[PDB]
Amino acid sequence: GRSLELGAADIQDLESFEAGRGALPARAYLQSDAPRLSLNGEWQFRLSPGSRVAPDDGWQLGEALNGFESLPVPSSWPMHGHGAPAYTNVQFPFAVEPPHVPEANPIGDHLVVFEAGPEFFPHALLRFDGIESAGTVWLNGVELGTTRGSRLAHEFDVSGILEQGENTLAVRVAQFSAASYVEDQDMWWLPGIFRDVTLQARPAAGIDDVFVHAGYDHITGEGILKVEASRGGQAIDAVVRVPELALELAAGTEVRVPAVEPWSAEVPKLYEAAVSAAGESVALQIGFRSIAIEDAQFKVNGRRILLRGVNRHEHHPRLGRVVPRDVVEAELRLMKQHNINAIRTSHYPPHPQFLALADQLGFYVVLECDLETHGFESAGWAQNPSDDPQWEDALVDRMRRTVERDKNHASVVMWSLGNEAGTGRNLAAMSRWTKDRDPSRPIHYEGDWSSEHVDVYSRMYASQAETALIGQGIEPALNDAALDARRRAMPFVLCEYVHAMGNGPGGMSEYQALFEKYPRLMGGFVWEWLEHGITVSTADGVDHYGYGGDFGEEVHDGNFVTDGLVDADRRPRPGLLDFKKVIEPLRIDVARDWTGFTLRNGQDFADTSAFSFRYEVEADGGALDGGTVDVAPVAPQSETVVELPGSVAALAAGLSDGRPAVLTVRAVLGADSAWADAGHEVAWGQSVREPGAPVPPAPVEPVQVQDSELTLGPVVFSRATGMPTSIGGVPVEKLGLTLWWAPTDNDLGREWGGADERPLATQWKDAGLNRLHTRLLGISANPGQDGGETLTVRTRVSAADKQYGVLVDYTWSTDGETVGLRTQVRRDGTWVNRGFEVEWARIGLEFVLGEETELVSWFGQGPHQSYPDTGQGARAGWFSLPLAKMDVEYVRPQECGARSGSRSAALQLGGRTLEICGDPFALTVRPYSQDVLDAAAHRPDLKADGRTYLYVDHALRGVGTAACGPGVLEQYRLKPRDADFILTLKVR
C-alpha cells in the first residue's frame, strides 16, 4: 500500500521541530562599509491556499510565470488584497495538534530579479530580517535553506550561486507552520516578507560579528571598554577608534577610559566609534552603562531607576507589520514627549533599525525573544512547546538570534525569554544560554512566577494591593524555601499594567504612588502603546478602523486588538494624556497662598537645569500676571521650595471672594532636544481660588396655569408629564434621571473576585438600568417670595419587572432671569437583583434639547475628558471646543467625553446660549442618544439625529481597568444612595 496524497513533502518540512536549515551563524546587525544592495521594491507574487496544491512548476526560475502579480516587498500580504487580516487573542486559529498544520494554509510564492555587480564577488550573502512564518529560499533555482522565527534575522551564503549580472531570487512563504505554535501573540496573523531583504558583499579580511562591552564605574567615573570582533567565528585582529575619548585600542582587550559621561535614558550619551580590519570597517554608537541588582533594586550606573514604560508592538493601519521608519521616529519622539523613558518589545524583537533609535533618543528597553505559547494554557499546558524536549533546538535558536542581533546596544537593559509561554525545560535552557553569552544584562520572564530562571520578579496586572505587598517584600512566600529566598531578593517589575483598552485606564495614580514609595518596585509598562486598528474604506468613502471579526474570521477576539494609548495612526487617546501627567518626572506642589511652590526632582540622574519654570495666573478674561522664576538646579531625588514673585501672592489676596482664578506653574524645555522644541511642557502644578456657590434666584415670578401647560418665568412645563418643554425658547424634548451609561470596554470585562462573575455591563442589563421609566406622582406650586412660587414635580424612576426605585423631586424657582433647579433623590426599596447589589454608573440628569449644539464651553477640568479614577492630565482652566471635538473617537464607541469637576458651562445653540452653573458636576454633550452610542459597534454607526443630549452628573463611577486586571477601585465605585444637588440655568 503506497501513499497517494499530494504535497506530503512540503508538509513534513512545515511540521518540523528543527530550526531553519543551512543559514550562516547568528550575528549582530552591524553598520558596515561593505557594499549592500537592498532587494526591496516590487516583487512578483502567487498565492496558493495550501501546500497540497502549491504548484511545483519551476516558478523559482523566473520563466513562464502563470498567475503572478506585482506585490511590494517588504509587505504583510493580507494588507494588499491577498486574503485578509485575522485577529485572535489567545485562541489558535487552527486545531491544536503540534506540530501539524491545517489544510487551509496560504502559500505565498515570491520572486524578484536583481542585478549583481562586481562589488558582490567573489563572496556575498542574502539577508532576510523577517519572514512570517516559514520561508524556503532559492537563488537561481538552487535551495539556500529555510527560515524559522518570524521576527528573527537569517543570512544565507550565496558564494558560488550568486552569478554576475542578473539573478533570480525565489522565496516560498507558508503562513502556518510548527512555528505558529510558538508565535501566538495577541495580534493580527499577517504572513509575508515584512522586513528588509538585502544582498551584502563579504570581502576578505572582513568583520562578521562585533560584541561591544561598555561599562561604567560610578564611583570613579571610568569607562570600561572592550570591543570584540570576529570573522568566521574566530577572534580577529581589528583596531578600535573612538575619536572623542582620545583612544585607539586593539579589539579583544579591556581598557579603563579615565572619565566618561555615562549613558541613561535621561542623558543618552553616545560616543561614535569604529572597529575596522583590512577589508571592512564597522560603525558603532557606544553607551557606557552598567546594570546591576543589589538590595533588591534594579540599578543603572549605581542609581535605582524608575521605569516609565509602554509595550511597543509593531503595527501600521494599512501596512500591517511593516512600520515605515518615519512612523518609527515619530512615535518614539511622541513617547518622549509624554515623559516615557522605557519600552518593552512585546513580544518579539523589533525592526533592526529600532535599536539605534532607542540608543539615541533615550529608553530603557526590554528586548524580548519571539516566543509565546499562550494557546496551550486552556489545556493545562499539555503539549506545551516550552517543555517538549523536541523544541529545545528551535527555542534556543530563537534566543540566540534574538540576543546576537542586538547585544551591542546600550538601550537594552534586559533580555526577555518571551511571554505567556508557561514554564518548562526549554525556557530554562534559553536562560542558561543567555547568562552564558551575555552576563551584562539581567533576564526577564513573567510566566514562571517561581522566578527560578530569571533575575527580576515580573508580573502582569498585579493589583495595586499585591503591588504594595511586594513593595514591602511581604508577599506570600514561595513553597520552595530556596527559591523564595532568591525571589525576595529580586526587584519587581510590572511588564504589563493599567490595561488601556477604551475609556481608561483608571487607577494609574494609585500604582505610581507605590513606585515612588518603594524602591524594590521598578515601575511598569502600560499595555499597550498603540491600537492595532486596520483602516477600512466604506462605500461612502468614510474611513474607520476595523478589528477582530470585521475581516471574516471564524474565530476572533473582537476589539481586544485595539487596546492602546494611541490609535493606529498614533493619534493620542486621553489615556496617554493622563499617563503623561502621572509619570511626570518632577512634581510641582503650588502653595495655597500663592507665595511659592515645592519642586521635587524625580529623575534618577539629571538635575533641573534643562527646564524653564514659567508661571501664569488666569482669570475669567485673559491672563493677569505671568513670567519666569529662576531655580537653582536641584539634584535627582532632592527638593527645594522656590519663591514666586510677590505680585502673584498679592494678586490672590486681593481677589474679591468668589472670583475664580488659577495659578499654573509649568516646567518646560529651556532649549530644543532631540525629541521636542523649546517650551515643551514636562511637568506642571496648580492652585485654584474657586468660585463661590451660585446664588439661587429669588422666587419672585409666579406659576401661570393654562389648561395644557404651566409657565414659570422662562420655562414651559407640560401638565401631563411635569417636565419642562422649553426654557427661553430652547425646545426641551425630555428631562429625566440617569443612572446608566453606554458600557466601556472595562465594563464589558469580568471583574474577578466576588461571586458575581457577570461583567458590570451585564449586571446593568439584568438590573434594567438601561431601560428606566418615570412615573409622575404629583405637581404643586408652593409659596415663594413676594407673590412668586416654587414648582415641585414629584416622580419615581424604576424599570419594568423591578421593585426597587428612586424618588426624584424637581423643584423650580425663577426671578425671570435665571431658573433655579433643586433635585433630590431618595432610594425606595433595596437595589438588589439576581442576588447582587446594583451599582450605578452615575447620579445625574439628561436634558434632550430640540436643537443642535455648535459649541461647548466650561470652567473646570480639561480640556480632554475626566472621570473619578482618570483625568489627572486634565487641569483647571477655561475651555471651549466645537461639539465634535468633545467626543472621543474610540473604535468601538462607548461612554466618553465627560468633563468632571465642572463649575459652569455654556452650550451655543443656534443663536442663543444655555448657561448652567452649580456645585461640581460632570458635563457631557453629544449629538446622539446613549442608546445609539451603546448599539454602535463602529464609529460610522453613530448618526446625529438633530438634537442635543446634555448630561449633568452629580456623581460618577470610575472606569477602572476590568477588561484586563483590576476593576474600578473601592473609593471610586458608585453604590446607590440618597443625593441632593442644586443647579442654576440661564438662556441669553
Add this chain to the structure above:
Amino acid sequence: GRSLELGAADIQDLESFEAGRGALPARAYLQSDAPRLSLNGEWQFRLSPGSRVAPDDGWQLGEALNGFESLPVPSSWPMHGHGAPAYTNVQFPFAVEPPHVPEANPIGDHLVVFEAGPEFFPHALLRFDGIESAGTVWLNGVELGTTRGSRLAHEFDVSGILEQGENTLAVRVAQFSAASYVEDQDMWWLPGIFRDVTLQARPAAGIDDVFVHAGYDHITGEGILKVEASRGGQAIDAVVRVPELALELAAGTEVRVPAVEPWSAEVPKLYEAAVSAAGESVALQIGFRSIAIEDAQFKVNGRRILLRGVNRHEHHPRLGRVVPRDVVEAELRLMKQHNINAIRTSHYPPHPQFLALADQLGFYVVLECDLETHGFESAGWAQNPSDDPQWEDALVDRMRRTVERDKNHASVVMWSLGNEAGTGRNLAAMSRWTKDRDPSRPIHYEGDWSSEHVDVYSRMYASQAETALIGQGIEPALNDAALDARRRAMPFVLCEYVHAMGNGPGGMSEYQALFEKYPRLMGGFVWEWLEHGITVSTADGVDHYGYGGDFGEEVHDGNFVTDGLVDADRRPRPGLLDFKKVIEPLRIDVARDWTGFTLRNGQDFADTSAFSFRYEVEADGGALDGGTVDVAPVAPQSETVVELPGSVAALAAGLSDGRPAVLTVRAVLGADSAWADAGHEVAWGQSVREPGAPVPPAPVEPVQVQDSELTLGPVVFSRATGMPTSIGGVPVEKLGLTLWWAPTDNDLGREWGGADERPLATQWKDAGLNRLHTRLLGISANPGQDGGETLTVRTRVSAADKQYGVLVDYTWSTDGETVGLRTQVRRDGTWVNRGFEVEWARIGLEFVLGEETELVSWFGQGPHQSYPDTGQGARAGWFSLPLAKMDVEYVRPQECGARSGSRSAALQLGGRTLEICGDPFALTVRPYSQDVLDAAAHRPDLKADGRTYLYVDHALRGVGTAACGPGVLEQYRLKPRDADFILTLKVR
C-alpha cells in the same frame, strides 16, 4: 399647595384594589328564552396613550366625534393596527409597584349606537363577557360601572337608563390597571373588548341563576338530580322537565332517577332539560357524574380515570384573544382525533361557549380562575397580591365569577384557584369560598406545594424520577406532620409536563409508563396545546409567524410564546403525532410469529365495541394480505389474545429471509362519531421482518491514478483532499464527519442540576462543535479482490484552539455497480472543555451534493420525523415525500426532519436517483446548510442555495424538554466514543 397634574381621577380608579363597581351579582351563563340583542359588529374607536391625555370631551354621547374610526368588537385591538402585540413571559412590562400603573398606558375609547325594541322593556341588562383589563361603561352618558377580571363576565342593570329606540353605549378601556398585577400569564398582552357584548331583556317572573346538581350512584346506577333556580338571589318556584328520563319535578328538590347512563369523556351522555317559570325558560344539558377522591385516587363514577390532557390557551394568529367558534369546534375535534380526553384552561376561564362543547365532545376540564402573580417571584414574593389583605375582595370576586359562570357543566371536574401566584391568605380565602359554594368538584392549585388548601397534589414538569417516587407515595415528607398526612392521601396530577417547545417533546413514553403503573398518578396536561404565533405579512407577501420582540417590545421573551403541539393555525407539529400514539387508549402488541396480538383496553369506561380491528401486511411493492378480525369486546382494563387469520402467519413463515415486510394491526372507528368519520385510527401496533444487512460489494474494480484525481469505479476522488468529488455523475462538493446540529429550543435551555449551567447549545459553541475542521493524514490503495483495490482515506477532525479530536478512516470498495463505504471513528484526546465533558449531537456524515433534490424515499420509521426520545408516532413502513415536506416549519427554525431507524433511502436528483443502504441510520435531507439553519431566526431567513445536504447518522442525541423541565434522559444522551459503521451507495 394645590395639585396641578392632569388625569389624577382616572388613575386613582385604575389603581384601585376594589373589584368592579355597580354590576349585578355573578351568575351562570344560561341558555334562556328571553330576548337578546348582540351588540357585536363595527364600533367606533379612539386610542389615547395615557389617562393624563385621554380626552374628557363628552365622547360618551356619540355627537361630534373627533378622532374615531371603525373597529370590530369583539377585538383584541393591537391586532387591528392600534399599537402592537407585546409578549412577556414572567417579566412584567412595567415597574413593579402595585397598584400603580405606568404613564404609558393605552386608553381605548369604544362607542356603539344600537336600537332597543319593546322586547327590552321595562327591564334589561348589558353583558360583557370579557374586557382586558379595566373598563368603564356608560349608557347614554350615564355611568353603569367598571369591570375587573379580564376573562370574567360582568352584567349591568340598564333599567331606567336604556331608552326606547336608539341608545349610545360607551366603554373606556385601559390596557393596564392594578388588575394587570394579577393577570401576568405567559401570553401576549392584548387589550380590548375581546368577548361578546350583549343586551338581554329581563322579564318579570324570570330565572337569573340556575345550579344543576347531577350525580351518579355507581353501585345502583341511579341519577341524583336537583336543579336549583333563583331570581334576585332567592329560591323561586320553577318546573324541571327532562323528557328523556320521563320526569317532571320541582326545582329545589333532590330526586333519585332510577337508572341513568353516566357521563364521562369517553361516553359524554347528555340529557336535554329545561327549567322554566312564568317569564323565562332555561335550557340545560345534564351529565350525571360524581367526582370523588378515595385511596389517594381521583375517581369519576367509581373508576380511577387517567388524564390525557393539554393546556388550552385562547389565541388566534390574526385576531389575538378572539377565537372564532368554527376554530373552537375544529381544534376540539382535532384534540379528540389525537386521543386527548382532558383540557386545562390555562390560565383563565375560556369563552362561555367553550363549556358546552366540552360537555358534548367529551373532556375532563380543569376550570381555572383568572389569577396569576408570577412576576412577583423574582423579588421573593414581596408585595405578592395573593397575600396582601387589600386584594382579598378583588381575588374572591375573581373566584366567585369563575365558579358561578360554569358551575352547571359536567365536563368541569376541578376548580383551579389560578396559577403561578405564590402562597397566601387570599388563595386560602378563594379555596374556602369554593368548597362552600360547590362541594362537588375538588380544588386544584399548584403554587403551594404544601397543598394545604387543595384536594389534589399538583406539580409542573416534575421529573420522571420524582413522578415515580410520588406514584409510590414515597416522596420526601412535608415538614408539618399534619399537612404531610393530608398530601400523601391526595392523588397526584401534572398540570404541565413534557414542555412541547420546538423539536420535541422527548421523554413522553417514560412519563406514560408511570401513569399506567401507579394509580395515585392521575396523568398530565402537555404544555401547551398551541403556539401563539402571530402572522406577519412581509414586503414580498410571504407569510410567517412572529413572536416576542418582533413587534417592538422593550422587554420580551422571544419565541417562548410558540411552545405548542399545534401552530397558531392548528397545523399539527410532530409532537402531537407522537403524543397521540403515547396516550393511545388501547395497546396492540403484535406477536413475533404473526399469529395474533394482545389487546389491552386502557379506557376507564368504554369497551372495545366501538372499534374495527383491521390488519395489513405490506411488502416492498404493495400489500400482500389484509382484512378484519372480530374481537369479542374486552372490558376496560381487561386483556385478551386475539388470533389473526392463518394466512398472515403462513405468509411470514414463507418469506425468503432478508425480505422486509410489516404487519400492522390497526384499531379504527367502526362508525362516525361526533369528532371523526368511520375508519379514523385510534391505536395501532406492528411486527417487522427486517431486511438482512446489505452485501458489501466485491472489490473487483481497481483505483485509477491521474495526477489530479483518483477514480475507483463510479466515484471520483480529489487527491488533494481525499474526499469524493462525484459518484455516478452526481457532484459531491463536500463530505465529512458531523458531531453537531443546529440547536433546538431545548438545547437553548439551561438544564438544572450539574455544575454546568450553560445550555447544551452554549456547551457546543464553547467546545467548537459547530466549526469543525478536517486535516488529511494519508491516502492509500490496498489489495482488494481479483485485481481490484480498496481505498483508505485517513483524516482527523477537530476544531481551532482545541486539543481533542477524532480520527476518521474512510474505506471504499467497488465492483462497478455499488460503492461500499466503511467509516471508523476513534477518539484522540479527552473530549473535555471549560471543565465539563463535551457531548455530541450525532455521529454521522454530511454529503453536500452539487444538484438539487426533488424527492426523498426511505424504508424505516415515518412518515414524520423521529429522534431517540421521540418518534413514537412514526411507524415502520415505506415512505416517499417531496423535499420541502421533509422539513418542519417551526417558527424559529432549528434541527428537525431526521427520520431515525432508516434502512434504505433514495434521493431523486434531477434524472438520477441515489440509493443508500446499510444498517440503521438516521436520514435527513435539506436544501440549505446547517449554519444557514442555525443563523435563521424566522422561516424566511432559510434560502435554498441550489445544493443538497444529505445527513446519514449512525448515532443521535435525544431532544429532551430542557427548555422547561427535564433535559435529554441518560439513556438518550450521546457521549463521545469510538464507532464503526458500514454504508453501501448506488446511482441509477
